[PDB]
A paper describes a structure:
As part of investigations into the C-nucleoside formycin A (8-aza-9-deazaadenosine) biosynthetic gene cluster from Streptomyces kaniharaensis, we have characterised a pyridoxal 5′-phosphate (PLP) dependent aminotransferase (ForI) that aminates a pathway intermediate. ForI is a PLP-dependent enzyme from the biosynthetic pathway of the C-nucleoside antibiotic formycin. ForI possesses the mixed β-sheet and three-stranded antiparallel β-sheet insertion characteristic of the PLP dependent aspartic aminotransferase family.
The electron density clearly indicates that the pyridoxal co-factor is unattached to the enzyme, suggesting it to be PMP. Despite numerous attempts we have not observed density for l-Glu or α-KG. These structural changes result in the pocket adjacent to the cofactor (bounded by Ala 25, Thr 60, Tyr 141, Trp 206) enlarging further and becoming more open to solvent.
Author numbering:
A (entry chain A), B (entry chain B): 0 to 423
């Protein structure tokens, strides 16, 4: 049924000018991905003219969906006045005030052009503040391509160092890994390295290891360890911030020293942020002599990304946050009903407006649970829905109960087709 | 004479929500920087309502100046269709075709959200391709905040390792440094490390060590060393690309394996690119199983930055490139005349549309040549001109003979005022 000839023709062009026709690993699918030309509200139109409901929203960036009129007005007005300057602007100050106001711990903020850069600068800040070399991160959790965090970042629960091809021992030896939600297992590792630990980098709701939240007991163990050792507690909320109105740590009853943000804070334009207590952020301050940690960047605090940010935070009201959490609960419940009626043991995890289908047992005719989840991703595309090819999804503010009901009908139909094709 | 009350008031707000009221080290000035609200063509209007001619153009990013109508149209129209997607778009293919066409060695390209990220991914690509740990870079050259390149990066010619506070030995020991334009001094270092060198990272026209071009002899020595050792030759042209129509290495008679680009290639929207021969770029290819080097990023190849890129490259015609080169030659000549008439030993370096005033001997009443250059930066601001506080500047395509003549008058007046204040 599905016509993808214009996607295939773009892919044939792309392979001549990009490696494997790709510029972003996460958006590649075999034999080629679907190419898209426009979005409006909750819906994306592909290059073959097919409109689908988007349930992943640029990897959970687009909390307000596609081309929200209030976002478009603010961004286009900023573009007209100049895209970037070699001087600070009023909107950087306005946006830092707006972001600082979201959480007590966001005393001072610094803007980058991505979450990948913001994670990197939060780790550099902790190393400059402590003058210690090691970082600790969660086994399996993903934090972007920066080489200190591109270690054990693939969903595995093993603690043995495993890094990207070429990441030197010089980097990999200074990143230690802790088991998620295992307080005693975590403290064993952290106590072994306490004298040398600059930071403990967590994600309170890491999607790559199943989108389960950090427990109170595990957050308490790490917060007490950081207070005792002097290690900086960094919460990477680039993806998970959206689960709470004041971010993920606040929802779970905890406080970070530094929080990394991105994605929803600007809801589509390039952004990252490092926010935390004044003392940890003081490594960046250039006002009293050379800073401990220089941090430049051509697009830092550019007024287009600041204007996108002001508009996003204005639209992300407590009422919007509540209503998308209602829709997330409706979506997760409809998926669990559909998986149980189909006779699969797969789980659906998530908080607020985030979810992830976590494939467990591979059904007949699939080599792995991940292959069965890729097949479900393709069947959902045929049935008018975009989700992540390993089960991630989210709600956008343009959605109502009708979109989630349409998704539930597509989800049940798709499961049926995946299972029937595996048995053929 | 100069009124900065609205800038002071923004700074007073900024210090409460950013470290030292700053989000980008390079745009800070004591006691506070000038804040700006808008740009049009070659001119910037500050928050106190004062219009000046911009001769630095967001650190040489804005090759087409501020809010170029054709740039504004392309960007604002792209925004209306969707700022970013979790799927590739037609404009990524169109822009990769446009950029690949600029140099024979740009066979395969990948997009990032910054030059800092692009440098990082080019170093990771060479380490993945060779499976060797070390990189070599130029003593003094700046490549952004990534910790492997944030070593010997502040204008010094010393080869002794000097890194940011907290950069661990595990990083710093794998970055070796070579003296710019010294073939035998460079080959001594590179031969000592040849078995362990993944790459030689250069900038062919590094502004931080005085904006002098790489010699034919030095580029030939490095190209031959890389061919012999299997090290990847990386040219970081994030700033220097603009000196030639086919980039900096081509102008100077050389070929890189990988070229890093940014800034002018999108002329004001967040961008970076890694462009090189197919074999080096193959580490990123996801089309034949898992790639050696995963490379994602929420804003990679976003259609707003791609649309900015297509418009910028379309506007950067051979005719435009020649005209800004002529204006740069006229500007450099007018500065050298003014410095000679004022009795300073200062030099003016640069190629094409780039220049740098290189302060040598401190005149009476200044502790250092750099303090004297900072004073000239402030006097130029008073006389209606923005340049860099250490002498960097550039020409933009909106400029004509009238802007370059106005600059020459302001430059001579400002030098007189700097010298008179130092002697007073
Ligand atoms: C937890 C986390 N941290 C950082 C990043 C990287 O952010 P960006 O895509 O803005 O570079 C991501 C992206 N998946 C993320 O999930
Ligand atoms: C040579 C060079 N490389 C890379 C960068 C970083 O690029 P961006 O500002 O886009 O991160 C810079 C910026 N100063 C640079 O000058």
């Amino acid at each position: 049924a599905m016509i993808t000839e214009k996607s295939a023709a773009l892919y044939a062009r792309a392979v001549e000018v990009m490696p494997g026709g790709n510029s972003r690993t996460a958006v590649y699918s075999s034999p080629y991905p679907v190419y898209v030309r426009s979005g409006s509200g909750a819906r994306v139109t592909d290059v073959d003219g097919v409109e689908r409901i988007d349930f992943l929203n640029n990897s959970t960036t687009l909390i307000h969906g596609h081309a929200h009129p209030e976002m478009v007005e603010a961004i286009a007005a900023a573009v007209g006045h100049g895209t970037s300057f070699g001087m600070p602007t009023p909107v950087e100050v306005e946006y830092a005030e707006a972001l600082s106001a979201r959480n007590e711990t966001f005393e001072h903020v610094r803007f980058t052009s991505s979450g990948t850069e913001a994670v990197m600068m939060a780790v550099q800040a902790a190393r400059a503040y402590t003058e210690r070399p090691k970082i600790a991160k969660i086994a399996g959790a993903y934090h972007g391509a920066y080489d200190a965090v591109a270690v054990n970042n693939d969903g595995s629960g093993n603690l043995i160092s495993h890094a990207v091809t070429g990441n030197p021992e010089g980097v990999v030896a200074n990143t230690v890994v802790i088991p998620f939600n295992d307080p005693e297992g975590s403290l064993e590792v952290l106590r072994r390295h306490a004298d040398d630990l600059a930071c403990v980098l967590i994600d309170p709701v890491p999607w790559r290891i199943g989108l389960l939240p950090a427990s109170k007991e595990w957050l308490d163990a790490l917060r007490e360890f950081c207070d005792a050792s002097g290690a900086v507690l960094i919460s990477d909320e680039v993806g998970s911030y959206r689960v709470g109105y004041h971010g993920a740590m606040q929802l779970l009853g905890a406080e970070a020293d530094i929080t990394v943000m991105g994605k929803v804070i600007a809801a589509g334009m390039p952004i990252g942020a490092v926010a935390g207590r004044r003392r940890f952020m003081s490594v960046f301050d250039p006002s009293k002599g050379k800073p401990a940690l220089p941090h430049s960047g051509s697009y830092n605090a550019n007024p287009v990304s600041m204007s996108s940010g002001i508009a996003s935070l204005r639209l992300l009201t407590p009422q919007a946050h509540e209503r998308i959490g209602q829709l997330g609960e409706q979506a997760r419940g409809s998926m669990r009903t559909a998986l149980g009626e189909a006779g699969l043991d797969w789980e659906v995890n998530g908080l607020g407006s985030l979810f992830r289908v976590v494939a467990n047992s591979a059904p007949a005719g699939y080599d792995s649970a991940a292959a069965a989840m890729k097949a479900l991703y393709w069947k959902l595309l045929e049935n008018g829905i975009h989700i992540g090819d390993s089960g991630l999804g989210c709600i956008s503010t343009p959605m109502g109960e009708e979109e989630i009901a349409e998704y539930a009908v597509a989800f049940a139909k798709s499961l049926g087709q995946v299972l029937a094709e595996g048995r053929a």
